[PDB]
Design a protein around this ligand. Sequence first.
Ligand code: K
Ligand code: K
Ligand code: K
Ligand code: K
Ligand code: K
Ligand code: K
Ligand code: K
Ligand code: K
Ligand code: K
Ligand code: K
Ligand code: K
Ligand code: K
Ligand code: K
Ligand code: K
Ligand code: K
Ligand code: K
Ligand code: K
Ligand code: MG
Ligand code: MG
Ligand code: MG
Ligand code: MG
Ligand code: MG
Ligand code: MG
Ligand code: MG
Ligand code: MG
Lengths: 98, 50, 200, 147
Amino acid sequence: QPNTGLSVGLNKGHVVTKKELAPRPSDRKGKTSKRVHFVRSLIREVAGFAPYEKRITELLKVGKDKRALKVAKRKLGTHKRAKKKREEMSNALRKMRA
Amino acid sequence: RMFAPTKIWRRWHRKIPVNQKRYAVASAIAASAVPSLVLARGHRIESVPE
Amino acid sequence: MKHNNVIPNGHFKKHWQNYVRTWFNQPARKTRRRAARQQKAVKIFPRPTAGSLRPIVHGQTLKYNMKVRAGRGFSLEELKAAGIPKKLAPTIGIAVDHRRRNRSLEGLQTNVQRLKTYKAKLVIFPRRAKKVKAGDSSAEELATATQVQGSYMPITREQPAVDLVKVTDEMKSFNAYGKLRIERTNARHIGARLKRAAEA
Amino acid sequence: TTRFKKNRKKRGHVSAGHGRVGKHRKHPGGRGNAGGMHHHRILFDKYHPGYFGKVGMRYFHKLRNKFHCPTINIDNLWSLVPQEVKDKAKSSNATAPFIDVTQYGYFKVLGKGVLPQNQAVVVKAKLISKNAEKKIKEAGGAVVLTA
RNA sequence: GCGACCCCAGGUCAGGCGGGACUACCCGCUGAGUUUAAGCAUAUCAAUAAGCGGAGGAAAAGAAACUUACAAGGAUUCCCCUAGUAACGGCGAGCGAACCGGGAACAGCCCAGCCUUAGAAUCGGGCGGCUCCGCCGUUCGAAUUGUAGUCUGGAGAAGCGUCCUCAGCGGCGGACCGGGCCCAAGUCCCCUGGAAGGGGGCGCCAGAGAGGGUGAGAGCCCCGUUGUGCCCGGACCCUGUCGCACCACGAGGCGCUGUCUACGAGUCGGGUUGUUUGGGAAUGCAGCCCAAAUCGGGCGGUGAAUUCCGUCCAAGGCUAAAU
RNA sequence: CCCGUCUUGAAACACGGACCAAGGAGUCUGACAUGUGUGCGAGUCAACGGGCGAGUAAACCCGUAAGGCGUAAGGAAGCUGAUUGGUGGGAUCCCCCUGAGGGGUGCACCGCCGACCGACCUUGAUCUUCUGUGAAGGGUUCGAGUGUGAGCAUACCUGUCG
RNA sequence: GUGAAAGCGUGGCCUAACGAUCCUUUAGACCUUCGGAAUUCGAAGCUAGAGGUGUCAGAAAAGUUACCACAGGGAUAACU
Ligand SMILES: [K+]
Ligand SMILES: [K+]
Ligand SMILES: [K+]
Ligand SMILES: [K+]
Ligand SMILES: [K+]
Ligand SMILES: [K+]
Ligand SMILES: [K+]
Ligand SMILES: [K+]
Ligand SMILES: [K+]
Ligand SMILES: [K+]
Ligand SMILES: [K+]
Ligand SMILES: [K+]
Ligand SMILES: [K+]
Ligand SMILES: [K+]
Ligand SMILES: [K+]
Ligand SMILES: [K+]
Ligand SMILES: [K+]
Ligand SMILES: [Mg+2]
Ligand SMILES: [Mg+2]
Ligand SMILES: [Mg+2]
Ligand SMILES: [Mg+2]
Ligand SMILES: [Mg+2]
Ligand SMILES: [Mg+2]
Ligand SMILES: [Mg+2]
Ligand SMILES: [Mg+2]
């Protein structure tokens, strides 16, 4: 949204024609190649899951999603990473079910 | 050891306002035009034309 | 302690006498820097002594956003718009900054115009005397080539001017204080209004 | 200047002006601000009220640039106008001088004092006080908001 | 029993490397108390002294997992200001940064990973040559548990166009530095003095009247000083010019793309303990426990959940100048 | 009565002093404060740095929207932000008359009381983006405020403090 | 509140009967802030009390020394 030209209120500031930032290679920092995804999947198949990952999967199988999230948080350290790990375990469980 | 040994960080220098410096310079220049003051300062100007 | 004096807070409880820095070498430092500048100018002759061209950038924060100063180097987008390859810009006296982002047109256009002016004012000697390439200058231009001592492109502000204008009824019937107060109130209550709208 | 120091006048007077009885000892009452509450309490209370205690909230990592807000008064607005602009405005009553106080470095306009008599003024600023805006309107000018 | 590999052992084997010394500055560790608080224990002294190590001519830092919230800046370092400020503190004594802004100087880069497989294109040693800080030939060895080449996020790979850019040698000077040789003028007359270099008189040089010596205050006695001239040697770096061949396979630049686009792990992060910091529900560091992710991860100075937004890309490495 | 010292009190049965020469103790620095001298003045300060220049550590010059202090204050903060006075004494000057007189003038300073800005309380027509604005009207409350600026630099003595 | 009312009542007929900073905790506001923007917890602010310093203008504090030490005191004991 363009600046209103006022020094107070919403969208305040000096009026300029805003420009979209030009694309740069750093826009793909969080992405990797299909080869890397394939290698990671194969190594996951070869190496299996960690004991705490198995515990989370068992809790999810039972149906204690809150307990699974709590265990993941206590293991990893943060709520965000615990949520991501619980979601990944849930996806693995769905794939196993199908 | 001497009492209160001298140190290098004594305030050696002075920061006089530029306006006062210019005042002093103008005063000295004006005085240089007075024959009485030039003689009083010890200069032999008895033979100077003007 | 005695009498009505400001409470003292001198920070002199360590071995501060061993960390005193004096400035008796100030004239010597000035002389050394001038000598280095002269040597560099002689070495880079006939290149300008002011250094490579720099972009025009805005001051940071609300205290200085009205000021224009010199930035580190021209952005990649500015170089692309001006038609100067980024690998060639440094070799012809143009500073390059691959980090600076271009968020508004005005700055990019200003820097592109600056680069165009620099190219118009630039004379490039051929790599080999007898060979003339695309970017090289003519012999007539090369002959009258001299070193510029000062800043060839000063970054100056547009001096303020007071103009006489007609005061219309629209301007006379504007409540600046009321506008400011209502904008402040809206900014303060935006969250509550959005919450109420979402609820209903 | 050592020769003007009063200790020079006290050469040959034994106590150097610090008394035979009391004398000049090292730190008879402690160092610095010692005893602010105990034996210097009277001094601290009578000359430095408010010294002890804390009030208000803290502000971690406070930067002053976001609070920068220079102010100018309407009695000082006219001084910003150049002389040629001033007499042009005096000659012509159909137009009013247009002052951008931001270019001179002011963010807010305050309403202290008075303006030149029978002179309209168009003032552009980031902020303005209610009294200043009222005075400008009464003078017959206008206020513009900018950032 | 032989052979291949692996790990290891002995060699005064052929050829190399290391230890220790110095202290003003520099880098890492360890680490007090005197003292101040008018007592004293947290604090302060001090992230100092002492102690243990490691370099250079500078070191260290350095190319954003940054600052900010702006109309945005853009490696590192240093100066001024910010500022005795925000903050910390038996909120007592005291302590105390950072960003913006103005200056000095400025410079950017190299790797790991998918990508020769029509053959490791790479490198070390011996030997023999050459215009010998290196190049060539040959032979052994290293290396596939990966040497070369391309690529490093600012990008890049691949494909198609543009025809825009890219290839040395030698001579003579300039610039810088270190040295050598020569080059002005009174020792005129008188007096006192052991001795004139002191006094008086008469002359002279001066881009040289800085300084020193000589029998007492010496511009002109001597060395020197000022300014020319000539001569010698380093540094092979910068710079001007001249003489000759100047080859674009290939690689770069620019434009396009309905294709790809690989980025560092017991590391980040979290819990806790100790220490430190202005960093305050915890600034950094370290021990122990847990332990990640790739439409993801770190930061946004009040802990927590939800929804957005801003900004960068750590866990590999090099780098002159301002000091 | 022998000096110096501490002392209510010293010639003291109070301490130091056998004698002479030379050396021997309120200093320098940082932060403030009053006073005074000097420059400028709503400004002031070029010495971080740059340009030079006694062939030169001096002197001279340079402030772009630099910075410090001042030029606005009140609130913890969000935030708001000086409507421009009256009166009693009072110096100087001008008139009438020569009384310790009368009229005009009324700077500095002091006393008293209003008004304005802000913290707090109170108050509320009209507009308004519904939470803001503010015609009128306030207060035994609070301020290191306003009501035609007085600072900045520099020198020295003195005083507190490290 | 009381009285019909004037009036009286801001603790006890009067002269004593009590307590700072920091921290904690309670009460009050459709109050302020958590500094990229919102909501909610949490935290931090403003005003008024409470938890106490009796050495009561308010450190957090056990002895012994004949094994003893220092700066002083005739401002102060043990003779004359
Ligand atoms: K005082
Ligand atoms: K005295
Ligand atoms: K006395
Ligand atoms: K607080
Ligand atoms: K070989
Ligand atoms: K490689
Ligand atoms: K990569
Ligand atoms: K990386
Ligand atoms: K840890
Ligand atoms: K992010
Ligand atoms: K005595
Ligand atoms: K005696
Ligand atoms: K200024
Ligand atoms: K308040
Ligand atoms: K009563
Ligand atoms: K007491
Ligand atoms: K004891
Ligand atoms: Mg280094
Ligand atoms: Mg200040
Ligand atoms: Mg800077
Ligand atoms: Mg070989
Ligand atoms: Mg003699
Ligand atoms: Mg000679
Ligand atoms: Mg400024
Ligand atoms: Mg109490």
